[PDB]
Design an enzyme around this catalytic site. Structure first.
Site, PDB file in Angstrom:
ATOM      1  N   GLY H   9       0.831  -1.188   0.000  1.00  0.00           N
ATOM      2  CA  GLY H   9       0.000   0.000   0.000  1.00  0.00           C
ATOM      3  C   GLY H   9       0.867   1.240   0.000  1.00  0.00           C
ATOM      4  O   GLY H   9       1.574   1.499   0.977  1.00  0.00           O
ATOM      5  N   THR H  10       0.834   2.014  -1.080  1.00  0.00           N
ATOM      6  CA  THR H  10       1.810   3.080  -1.263  1.00  0.00           C
ATOM      7  C   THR H  10       1.236   4.141  -2.194  1.00  0.00           C
ATOM      8  O   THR H  10       0.087   4.059  -2.635  1.00  0.00           O
ATOM      9  CB  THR H  10       3.126   2.521  -1.812  1.00  0.00           C
ATOM     10  OG1 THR H  10       4.023   3.599  -2.107  1.00  0.00           O
ATOM     11  CG2 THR H  10       2.878   1.710  -3.073  1.00  0.00           C
ATOM     12  N   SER H  11       2.057   5.149  -2.479  1.00  0.00           N
ATOM     13  CA  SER H  11       1.749   6.191  -3.450  1.00  0.00           C
ATOM     14  C   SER H  11       2.962   6.372  -4.349  1.00  0.00           C
ATOM     15  O   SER H  11       4.015   6.823  -3.887  1.00  0.00           O
ATOM     16  CB  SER H  11       1.390   7.508  -2.757  1.00  0.00           C
ATOM     17  OG  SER H  11       0.331   7.332  -1.835  1.00  0.00           O
ATOM     18  N   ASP H  26       6.399   7.489  -1.430  1.00  0.00           N
ATOM     19  CA  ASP H  26       6.393   7.679   0.012  1.00  0.00           C
ATOM     20  C   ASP H  26       7.229   6.576   0.661  1.00  0.00           C
ATOM     21  O   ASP H  26       7.905   5.803  -0.021  1.00  0.00           O
ATOM     22  CB  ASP H  26       4.961   7.714   0.545  1.00  0.00           C
ATOM     23  CG  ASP H  26       4.324   6.340   0.609  1.00  0.00           C
ATOM     24  OD1 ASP H  26       4.402   5.592  -0.385  1.00  0.00           O
ATOM     25  OD2 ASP H  26       3.749   6.004   1.663  1.00  0.00           O
ATOM     26  N   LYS H  42      11.412   2.768  -1.366  1.00  0.00           N
ATOM     27  CA  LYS H  42      10.618   2.039  -2.343  1.00  0.00           C
ATOM     28  C   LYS H  42      11.152   2.173  -3.760  1.00  0.00           C
ATOM     29  O   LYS H  42      10.643   1.503  -4.663  1.00  0.00           O
ATOM     30  CB  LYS H  42       9.163   2.511  -2.288  1.00  0.00           C
ATOM     31  CG  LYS H  42       8.503   2.279  -0.945  1.00  0.00           C
ATOM     32  CD  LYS H  42       7.105   2.860  -0.904  1.00  0.00           C
ATOM     33  CE  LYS H  42       6.489   2.682   0.471  1.00  0.00           C
ATOM     34  NZ  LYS H  42       5.157   3.324   0.581  1.00  0.00           N
TER      35      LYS H  42
END
Lengths: 223, 210, 191, 143, 205, 215, 189, 205, 224, 190
Positions: H9-11, H26, H42
């Site tokens: 779960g990330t952007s 992020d 990341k």
């Protein structure tokens, strides 16, 4: 796959007196999100055949790779690849239908619906449909998905039987296809305003129109 | 889980005469409420005066007919172009169907032709290969409407033996017209293949809904 | 399917019932629940149709091969151990099937009878008693068993067990086949 | 301010919960003969396997009227629901017609159902015991 | 939701500005992938200058809105024009007390002389939140950032109209359940003004 | 009182023990001075055609008409109950019934039963306030439309309506458009067939009911 | 003791009707009459008996109030409303109504679903477990505007052909109904 | 998605500009509602100027990235520096051929002297798309509008940095599974540049 | 209700020598969406009681309405309900716990976790916890949700026993609670940087600080 | 629980199994109730509910006989039982129950036998049975309407011999009762 993720909606096609017309919109939807605009879902295979694919986009790209490999293998090593040894629409459809049925029997289907449209070397029109189950059929008008419930009743008004094919000009068929696309953009929530169209004529060859937009939309009857 | 089957909703009928056989079918292909096509033949000439039909899931029937035709080609290659008899074809089709015992074809199959004495013969197959020779067999939707119509006008026990080919064609057309009137899946056309000593002849008749 | 085994001072007595597979009217005169493993070792089996007969015949073939190869007879203990190994090996990669085996032999080298019971999972127990099938007989056997019983007394005890069991069977209990294994070999009791 | 009826299930049970058909021999047990339900209907069987819509339909009108009374109390005051309930109580109390089950004209006027029809009106909805005037007299008077 | 029920996949916005409030929405109703209504009016009038938009079950929201309008007529006959807070409280009570049987969410936009225009939101569950501006619906999730970057207090009427138009155009662009025309109502001291914008206008923004 | 719940447990028990419990194109189009409703006339009990000439246009009141899909018995019962209520209300008020009143009655009745009454309706009518067209869902939601379609053949009819609809239509144009939509449903859908029934309600005139307008 | 199911067929003639039901030969018949209106019910036997008793009750009260017999159309409406009353607990039945109006003389037949939806037919009605095979036989055999003898022969042949195609003690009961005379016949196969 | 696994779960954002490409993300890894890793890098490098960001199953994407880096090392040993298109094709083949068993999504950013900076996106399923910019992850849904309103072709380096910072700050603000610091890699002809931005800086935007 | 929809994360409270301190962040989250920011989850009931609620926000507002109703009922014809007949933390907690257990027994619970903090009229500290099941308990430090797993270890190092209470000043307790809130903002995904704090002291009386932000955050080591 | 009934030209013979009660060892006719001096009822089914239903029916019929000073006919008794059985399951899950009613109508001077199943289906029968997995072949072959009481007892004995061949010895036996013009008797010796 086992469930589609990115999908395209509908392809609609019709026969007229000298050829075939096929059309499909440019959208890859991610669930209810209209994620990708600019997906070409009409693949020209040679100069006499166009393949329209709806459903899973990754499987569609796999089918495009198969078609490219087929074209490249046709020229290996015939020097008459552009000559009478070119691929026919019937050959392409037979290959694709065999693949679809074999993968259905393998419990690993390609989640797609496919329309092959074109002109044979003797001038005959070819229009065929095959889906993920391997079900194949032909008709003077063909459509997939929502089009099969909305665009088909319109087009069958123009070409209702085989005797109506010689009476139908290219202008009338193109107008019918464009109107059906407008209706689909009206009543389909996964549709796009931008679409591509392809005409295959036994005299003028292949005409591929891109960046076509639905126009003359009636919204003024608000109240 | 992926469901590999489907249903396309046709109607077929086979009748064995004194010196001829008839296999007829409606030409409408549908997907459960919609009309896919109004003309899609389901009765095929397979060579050596044998007509075949596999009604039900269309993909399975197409696959079965394809395999049978290829097998007949190899039979001609390997046996000095010998004519394949109707009973041998029935056995071949039984083996083809039972080869998928644990993943069966979803079809009902009827074949028609002439036996070694020149008399008409019709064979009906269950989906996993069980087969038998019959005088008359109706399959698919509206079979329960077609069989009583035929039994009302023919004494299978004018006797069927003395009927001519034209009379049989007319009776089949009448039964299909009635079924089209009473059934929503029947219509749009009827195609009849007739097998005699001169070969296979094709007839087409338009039905309601055009 | 009901199997009973009683070991006495000088022999082993095995009683078995008939099949009545499923709603099939069969008139026959044979024992389909017993295989002779060797001239002094007998096997009775009760369980699922098809699998149990296959296993019993496989065991019988293996033991006959050993007897021909060595010109010698295995002891009941070795036979029971081989049966346990094969039973545990059969369900190694498949769903277990219902099967219960009573092996009754007479060790000639030790000059004494022996009885073993093997269940469906492969548990082998040496016992003076034994029963499988209908489910009280244990209480009666415990009340009326002595290690030094003769053959006649064992047969009388078996008759008492049969009479007790018949009063609960749905009147379709036909003749129970009874066999005796001792120093003279294997025989069948007419009664 | 409810719309769908709420709190319809029973929070407790007893063998003398129905005071009308209590047995005279054993007052803590119900009288099965005078129930005339068929003779094989335990009370526990009425706590399971019901249609999920039956409770909603049975209590719908009462729930709507309770919401209306709450609205009147919020907007007008206590006096308005007090008077509406008083009128309805007076109309309901002074009607005793043991031979008929049809509602009165005045009740329908108060309920604003003068020209309204529902399936309850269309379908208003033999025995050896308890089908007489005297049972209704006892129930009405609390004898 | 109930099986076979009609859901409300909308795009709803309500923005407070210097002279009052503006409430806007799209006009699409869907039954999955099929558009059952190209042109639906999602702006519900509960009082003269108290309007609302609905989400969740359509039948439940219609019943709740009808009861609230009845309640506000009863209130008006006694005490006169109700405040937006009172309408929000009635909506909240109806949604909260029935949340075990009805699925309903409301955005209420009102104007009155005392408070000079207000926006309330009642999400699923029945809680109430008073906000300078609110967004709701399936498409709203795609414009959370944009609105947060483009809202100012005490904007003019034209600026607020443009802000709502841009935000709803993006919401229509990305959400498949959001449709053709943009309808807005402007509530000020002058009166009630209705505005409509067509796809050929906002799709070129 | 009302609809009964007796034998519900018995019917469920029979269903659990292998006892089988035994077991359309409609359009509405507004024009410049009224509204038209049209329907197909085929009635089928499954794949078998029970009746080739079935009247599906039902009268709530002399100038308020409706057609339905879904459970047939529910549709008929709800239409008749609302017609009785409308007639009583008209007698009480000494006024011509309004379409909005029938809409309110239908909506509240269907919402009361929480979708368990499977009635899906198109209701058209004319009253002293003008002409009105509405669609009504089983769970209690209603919508207003200038042209509406319903039934299994509703997509073909909607395609035809989207092809040939304008703001200003004459009576003849609207009748032709509605008939064309019903014909498309007849040809392209297996559930629709046979003839077309039409009802035209014009402001200031009697309702005109044309059964078998096109055979 | 097993009497569930069965078949009922109704046909219209020139100025007459025919209604026939299956029977087990050898007292449970599935055809009842309430004057000059006939009702045949197939399905669950307990529901058949219950409906017969209820309709006898209601028609007796109707005749006591109206001082005249009830007509087939009014009886059809009554059956429809009675079936719809049990909306969520319906009887497992298929009923068929036949008769001749006493005043106009027009024949009338109709069939019902389990919750009272009316199917008013002009040619014939078939109710039963299969309703697909006997339906085809009736479709092949029926002709409009038959005389009472022709209608009796047609409906009897339909029943016999249904009986032959899938027994031992099978029988049939046939009613030929005219405006003045009603004939009841048994078929012993 | 197997039970008990770790999801990404990330952007993720990737933007092409005048001189090259920039990839930003992020730094939050969450198991349920617990932040398992507050500081995560990341930005995965598969070649000197070919980087990627991953979504879906962490283990599957890690295995795929390892195989891709190995493949590109073999290619470099044979033919030299690969193009971004080649790396994207290898990623697509790996993701598509195993999609029935692995859940992987990739955003690939690259630079070479021929094509001059490119972005490819491979969503779940295995299809590949080439875009002037791409966004992915759970927090991307909230910035579909904003990005669509603020992207220009051939932006300068500083404008691209500001655009990515604003968009990722909004995604962090609205998405629970996103937070921490912003990391960016600038791939141009002059080399590889690394940038980090802290919450006290971007939260004031 | 049957399932929470909009929620708040955690409330943390501790006793010190002369009073109690309670704190909670300002956020109402919608699943993984951090939807509503300006949400006040500390409710002062009178001059010597604060109630902190976590969980379903609609049920929290219902409980706020109940508390306001209780306050208004206390003053009904009660001229002394300002000093002598004012409400006490024990009264409020007993009422709330009765409500929670009764609605649990009705199979219609209020999906909340509640901490009541305050000072009795005789100077005793009061700090007790009740949840949606009706489970109640007391301790010198209390926390709900993620705080119950992370804030309590930090707080129990300052006040470990009942005898540590007289040794803890207000400054130390407030610093410990601020540090716990910072740790929660570090490690809770559904948390917020903004929080409200409340100090109830038997001498000063009440101090309700709003708009407090987590400060002094170590993020630099992310360079590596 | 198995019940049998045969109607001979002037009598009704009802046979019922003695006792089977779960796994309780009992020594000790609990499956019959005398509805009227010339009407007997046999029942078989689920424990508890069936006895409640039978006793309820008996109480109602005794009340009718007391009120009217008259004996209700077997047909009317059967109709009342069918109505009560249908009413009992109108709002609950149905329970297993099967009833045989045998009487001697004095006005018509005829024996009568009725069978009612668990759903409330009443059938007038010459012979009937319940609880056996048939025996209807022997009854069909060896039954005549004009059989005497002795011939009916012989047919019943043959049926009982057929039954007591695939049943365990736990099947204690069968109690036989006869209804005729003189009332109800128990066949003790035979």
């Amino acid at each position: 796959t086992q469930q589609p993720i990115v999908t395209g909606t509908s392809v609609i096609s019709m026969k007229y007196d000298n050829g075939v017309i096929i059309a499909a919109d440019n959208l890859g939807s991610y669930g209810s999100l209209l994620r990708f605009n600019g997906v070409e879902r009409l693949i020209p295979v040679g100069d006499n055949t166009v393949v329209g694919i709806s459903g899973d986009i990754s499987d569609m790209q796999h089918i495009e790779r198969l078609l490219k490999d087929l074209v490249t293998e046709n020229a290996y090593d015939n020097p008459l690849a552009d000559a009478e040894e070119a691929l026919e629409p019937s050959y392409i459809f037979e290959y694709l239908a065999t693949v679809m049925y074999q993968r259905r029997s393998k419990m690993n289907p390609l989640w797609n619906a496919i329309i092959v449209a074109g002109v044979q070397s003797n001038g005959d029109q070819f229009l065929r449909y095959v889906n993920l189950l391997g079900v194949t059929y032909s008709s003077p008008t063909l459509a997939t998905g929502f089009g099969a419930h909305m665009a088909n009743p319109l087009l069958r008004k123009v070409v209702d039987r085989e005797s109506d094919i010689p009476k139908t000009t290219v202008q009338v068929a193109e107008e019918a296809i464009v109107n059906a696309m407008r209706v689909l953009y009206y009543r389909d929530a996964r549709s796009s305003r931008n679409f591509s169209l392809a005409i295959i004529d036994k005299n003028t060859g292949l005409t591929f129109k891109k960046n076509l937009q639905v126009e003359n939309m009636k919204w003024d009857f608000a109240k | 889980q992926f469901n590999p089957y489907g249903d396309n909703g046709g109607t077929i009928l086979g009748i064995a005469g004194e010196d001829f056989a008839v296999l007829a079918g409606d030409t409408r292909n549908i997907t459960d409420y919609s009309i896919n096509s109004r003309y899609e033949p389901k009765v095929f000439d397979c060579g050596d005066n044998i007509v075949m039909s596999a009604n039900g899931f269309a993909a399975d029937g197409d696959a079965l007919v394809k395999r049978f035709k290829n097998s007949v080609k190899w039979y001609h290659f390997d046996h000095n172009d010998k004519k394949l008899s109707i009973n041998s074809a029935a056995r071949n089709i039984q083996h083809l169907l039972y080869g998928k015992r644990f993943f069966p074809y979803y079809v009902h199959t009827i074949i028609a032709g002439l036996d070694e004495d020149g008399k008409g013969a019709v064979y009906s197959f269950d989906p996993v290969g069980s087969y038998e020779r019959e005088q008359c067999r109706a399959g698919g939707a509206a079979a329960s409407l077609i069989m009583p119509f035929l039994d009302n006008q023919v004494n299978f026990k004018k006797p069927l033996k003395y009927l001519s080919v034209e009379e049989v064609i007319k009776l089949v057309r009448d039964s299909f017209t009635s079924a089209t009137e009473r059934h929503i899946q029947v219509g749009d056309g009827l195609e009849i293949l007739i097998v005699t000593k001169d070969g296979v002849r094709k007839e087409f008749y338009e039905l309601k809904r055009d | 399917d009901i199997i009973l085994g009683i070991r006495v001072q000088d022999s082993v007595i095995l009683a078995s019932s008939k099949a009545v597979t499923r709603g099939i009217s069969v008139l026959k005169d044979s024992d389909d629940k017993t295989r002779q493993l060797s001239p002094h070792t007998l096997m009775s089996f009760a369980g699922e149709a098809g699998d149990t007969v296959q296993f019993a015949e496989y065991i019988q073939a293996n033991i006959q091969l050993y007897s021909i190869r060595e010109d010698y007879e295995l002891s009941p203990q070795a036979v029971s151990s081989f049966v346990r190994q094969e039973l545990a090996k059969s369900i190694r990669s498949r769903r277990p099937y219902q099967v219960n085996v009573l092996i009754g032999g007479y060790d000639k080298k030790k000059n004494k009878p022996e009885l073993y019971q093997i269940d469906y999972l492969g548990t082998k127990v040496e016992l003076p008693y034994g029963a499988h099938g209908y489910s009280y007989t244990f209480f009666l056997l415990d009340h009326h068993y002595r290690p030094d019983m003769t053959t006649e007394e064992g047969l009388d005890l078996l008759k008492l067990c049969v009479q007790e069991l018949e009063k609960r069977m749905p009147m379709d209990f036909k003749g129970v086949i009874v066999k005796i294994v001792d120093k003279d070999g294997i025989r069948q009791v007419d009664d | 301010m409810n719309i769908v009826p709420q709190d319809t299930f029973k929070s407790q049970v007893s063998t003398d919960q129905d005071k009308s058909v209590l047995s005279s021999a054993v007052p803590s047990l119900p009288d099965t003969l005078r129930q005339q339900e068929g003779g094989a209907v335990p009370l526990s069987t009425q706590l399971n396997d019901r249609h999920p819509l039956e409770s909603t339909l049975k209590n719908w009108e009462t729930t709507q009227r309770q919401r209306q009374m709450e609205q009147y109390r919020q907007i007008f005051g206590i006096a308005e629901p007090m008077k509406r309930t008083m009128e309805m109580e007076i109309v309901n109390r002074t009607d005793f017609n043991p031979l008929s089950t049809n509602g009165s004209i005045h009740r329908d006027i108060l309920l604003n159902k003068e020209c309204s029809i529902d399936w309850e009106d269309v379908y208003p909805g033999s025995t050896m015991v308890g089908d007489d005037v005297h049972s209704k007299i006892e129930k009405q008077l609390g004898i | 939701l109930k099986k076979g029920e009609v859901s409300l996949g909308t795009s709803i916005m309500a923005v407070t500005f210097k002279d009052g409030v503006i409430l806007g929405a799209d006009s699409r109703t869907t039954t999955g992938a099929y558009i059952a209504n190209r042109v639906t009016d999602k702006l519900t009038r509960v009082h003269d200058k108290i309007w609302c938009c609905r989400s969740g079950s359509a039948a439940d929201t219609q019943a709740i809105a009808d009861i609230v309008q009845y309640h506000l007529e009863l209130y008006t006959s006694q005490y006169g024009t109700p405040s937006t807070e009172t309408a929000a409280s009635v909506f909240k009570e109806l949604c909260y007390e029935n949340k075990d049987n009805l699925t309903a969410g409301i955005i209420v936009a009102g104007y009155d002389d005392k408070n000079k225009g207000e926006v309330y939101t009642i999400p699923l569950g029945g809680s109430v939140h008073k906000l300078p501006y609110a967004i709701a619906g399936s498409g709203s999730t795609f414009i959370y950032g944009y609105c947060d970057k483009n809202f100012r207090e005490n904007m003019s009427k034209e600026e607020t109209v443009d802000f709502i138009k841009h935000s709803l155009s993006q919401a229509i662009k990305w959400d498949g359940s959001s449709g053709g025309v943009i309808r807005m109502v402007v509530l000020t001291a002058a009166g009630v003004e209705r505005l409509i914008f067509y796809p050929d206008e906002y799709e070129q923004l | 009182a009302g609809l009964s719940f007796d034998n519900y447990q018995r019917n469920n028990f029979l269903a659990e023990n292998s006892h089988t419990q035994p077991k359309t194109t409609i359009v509405g189009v507004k024009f410049n001075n009224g509204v038209v409703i049209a329907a197909d006339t085929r009635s089928t009990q499954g794949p078998i055609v029970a009746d080739k000439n079935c009247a599906k246009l039902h009268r709530i009141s002399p100038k308020i008409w409706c057609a339905g899909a879904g459970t047939a018995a529910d549709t008929e019962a709800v239409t008749q109950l609302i017609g009785s209520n409308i007639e009583l209300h008209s007698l009480y008020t000494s006024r011509e019934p309004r379409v909005v009143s029938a809409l309110q009655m239908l909506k509240q009745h269907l919402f009361k039963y929480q979708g368990h009454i499977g009635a899906y309706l198109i209701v058209a009518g004319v009253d002293p306030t003008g002409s009105h067209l509405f669609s009504i869902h089983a769970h209690g939601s209603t919508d207003v439309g200038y042209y509406l379609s319903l039934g299994s053949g509703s997509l073909a009819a909607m395609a035809v309506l989207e092809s040939h609809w304008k703001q200003d239509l004459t009576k003849e144009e609207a009748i032709k458009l509605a008939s064309d939509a019903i014909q498309a449903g007849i040809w392209n859908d297996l559930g629709s067939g046979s003839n077309v029934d039409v009802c035209v309600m014009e402001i200031g005139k009697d309702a005109e009911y044309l059964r078998n307008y096109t055979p | 003791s097993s009497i569930n199911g069965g078949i009922v067929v109704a046909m219209t003639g020139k100025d007459c009707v025919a209604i026939a039901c299956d029977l087990r030969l050898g007292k449970f018949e599935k055809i009842f009459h309430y004057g000059h209106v006939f009702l045949g019910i197939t399905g669950l036997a307990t529901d058949v008996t219950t409906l017969n008793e209820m309709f006898r009750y209601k028609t007796n009260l109707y005749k006591l109030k109206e001082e005249r017999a009830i007509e087939p159309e009014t009886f059809t409406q009554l059956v429809s409303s009675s079936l719809y009353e049990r909306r969520f607990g319906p009887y497992f039945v298929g009923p068929v109504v036949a008769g001749i109006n006493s005043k106009s003389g027009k024949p009338f037949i109709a069939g019902f679903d389990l919750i009272g939806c009316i199917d008013e037919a002009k040619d014939f009605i078939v109710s039963g477990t299969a309703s697909d095979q006997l339906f085809g036989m009736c479709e092949s055999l029926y002709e409009p505007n038959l005389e009472p003898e022709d209608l009796f022969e047609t409906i009897s042949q339909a029943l016999l052909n249904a009986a032959d195609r899938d027994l031992s003690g099978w029988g049939a009961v046939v009613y030929i109904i005219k405006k003045d005379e009603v004939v009841k016949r048994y078929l012993k196969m």
